[PDB]
Design a protein around this nucleic acid. Sequence first.
RNA 1: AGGGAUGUUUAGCCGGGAAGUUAGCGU
RNA 2: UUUUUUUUUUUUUU
Lengths: 546, 341
Amino acid sequence: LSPREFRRQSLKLQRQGELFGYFAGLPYVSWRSLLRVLHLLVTKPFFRGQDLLALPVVCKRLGVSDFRVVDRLLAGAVVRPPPFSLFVASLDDWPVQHHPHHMHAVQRLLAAICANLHNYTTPDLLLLFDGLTALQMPVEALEEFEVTLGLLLLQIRARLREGGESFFSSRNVLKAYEIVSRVAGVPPECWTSPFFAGARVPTEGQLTVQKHALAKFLNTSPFTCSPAHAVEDLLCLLGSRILAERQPPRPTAAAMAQEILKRVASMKLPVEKDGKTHWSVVELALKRQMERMQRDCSSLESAVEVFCAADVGARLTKSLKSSLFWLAELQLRQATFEAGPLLSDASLARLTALTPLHMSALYFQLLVNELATPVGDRLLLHALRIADHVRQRLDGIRRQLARQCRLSAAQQERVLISLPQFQQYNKELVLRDRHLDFSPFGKLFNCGVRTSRDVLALVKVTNQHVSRAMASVATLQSSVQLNGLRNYCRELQEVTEALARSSRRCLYTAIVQIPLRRKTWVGPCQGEVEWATQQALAIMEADGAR
Amino acid sequence: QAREEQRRQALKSFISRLDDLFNLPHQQWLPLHSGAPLGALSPTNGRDDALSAQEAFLAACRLASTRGDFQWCLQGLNLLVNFGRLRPDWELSDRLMALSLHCRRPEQAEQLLSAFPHFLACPPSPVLLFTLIDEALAAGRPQDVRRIFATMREQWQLALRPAFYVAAIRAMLLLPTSADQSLKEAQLVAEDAAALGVPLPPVAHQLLVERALTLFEERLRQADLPGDCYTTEELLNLAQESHNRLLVDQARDAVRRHISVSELFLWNRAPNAHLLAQAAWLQWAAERFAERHNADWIQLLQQSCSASLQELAGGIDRGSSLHRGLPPALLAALIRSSDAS
RNA sequence: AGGGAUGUUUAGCCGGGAAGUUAGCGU
RNA sequence: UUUUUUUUUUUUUU
């Protein structure tokens, strides 16, 4: 499917619900192609097929980033006449530009919904409310998230008591309860704030939109929710258990979310311009013998339950008779990840508390933490594992990178001689992935490495583990102060410190000896998209204006 | 001589030679960009076929692994800037920061954080900034991590992180000062983490602070000192306050991390018992007088007597705190009260 | 598992200015 | 055609 015919039948493909499928296809996506797609992206953003779910991912990789474009797309789904849970989870790793207030992706949904809070019906209320269920930003953009969540409840309460035929069914009551229950239990402190206490008919810029809703709601009600509004929510449900079409609504939604200012362009890559268009003690031995039978069978997710069941029963039986009258299984760990691992997930955590190179680092941090609470766990596993890791680091990637990516001697005596020779042989100085052999990297206690990115990817994982472990050792050194302790501190500090600092050094080398810039042949670029974006926007207000 | 001769010679010539290039008119200078786009013979041809000014300078910076070559690299940088051939980017800020580090020059690294936003577009990588904090701790200088933290925090460009707050706390408690002086400075950072957007620290935060809180003055004031305090009210009051902060924080963290004679242990589901260790402390009194001053724990400690929690036949915690107890606060505390008695 | 991941070079015409150039009769 | 821009504009095919 060449791009020429793709644009001709673009309109038809949208209707069928299969638009993005052919886009992530053949190469040759120029401005011509980009523009065409963008044209329809802001004219009538209505999706019914699977394109809805695959929209966010394409945008991420594309380059398109605008406050207007982004906003318009989201508003298409908001309006009402696959699961919703999936859609919201996709709203991550998508910064928003040209916006001094909301820069992330999670703030879009909190604005759209809130704005149109007054144009919802009871059946659909539950739909939006289902976002708390599992399948946002770390700390930032969190006050807004919980503030808007409480507003939903307000509407629900008011709407439910309107005098029930649909949600009062035998099956709908159970569904509703599931969601409600999740909220109740830990009322956030944000509810008990002056923002909600303002029942009597300078605010932050982030809550500009949220503040607007309150004013409206209160006026049409004839009330606030300051405290943890509960009981009433549950009491109502207890009685039933113990006994142009869609075109008009969009632009108003964007207008309400629109800021006072037109466009606050803090950062602009291209040149500043403007484009326009013209259209009694017997049971003890009966269960204690069932502890060593699983060792051979388990040498996984189901085998762990056998050991836990036997361990608790061995201790409880003897406890009753104790105050009435008056293990070396860790050795097997040296032959599962130290001699060739295969499919070892994070489950090793549970198989450590008395029960590639990244895998070994995990165990290092866990063993040191438990010991912090002399020959059998220090000079046998703790000190032996460090020798293997250090051996594969000095002569591993550290040195490898220094021989393949560094400048060769050939070039020294070929180019780096005179000035005139620099203007003809400059082409040979370039370094690419293609020119770099990944074979040496595949034997580092593992082809699992294809690109340069993979090499770098396997660096930050190992340094993270050791970095955390160093803090635990340091804390113990400054805590035991307030002659047997000297042996357990002098040797532990000199050995632990050698790996913490040395490992960090590797990162420095790995970050510098890598290809400069370069990208995969996909399509448009950030420079091209930026100009296209503005043209795609101004185009809409030319045709429809006449 | 492989590491001395072949290293200095290669770098010396590269910068020296480059300088001479600039003397020629603009017609003979290197292109700014790699190449023309598709817009301007198969699509793979071109695009990436030429050497850029930026690419050449960064390529020669890989040779430094000593302090002497660090100065040399700076020389080249100036050339670009002065001739207007430098395009700030994410990459630029990342390699520069790291280059200093690789040359064993931590001193210079810190200066970058306070001079990047004046001449650069993008900030450095978050990873790099965190790594420099551990550098100072390894050398044994916990006093140099206070100024670096404040600059990062004050800056608006850089996104706030919760993890970053952990390092700071840990480094202050290890300062070589008095018991009361070290803890007082640490509490200031803790407080600061509750005002500006009410950040939520990890679950493994409040434990550390609490550990030393009720051990350095509380415990000390009832063991040897009152032989037959000045802030007793604050110590007790802050003890409980710390705990409270944890509760609120932990509840809000689970909603965003992974989108989750009288007793209340009958129908409370199966919570984590790890937290009950700190809350099981018995309140003696505000003063020395424990019998005539204050009149307001076994039932609480009955959940784990033998140092055996409901782990094997209970719930599972994600990213929990230290599982261990309080050796310096529990082991030596109850024995004394009993044996001596 | 977030100390993760994602990001990377936009195109044509016309007018004026500086350095180098100041070889052309093929229209 | 290449550095400089506080003198401009243009980019679609049912």
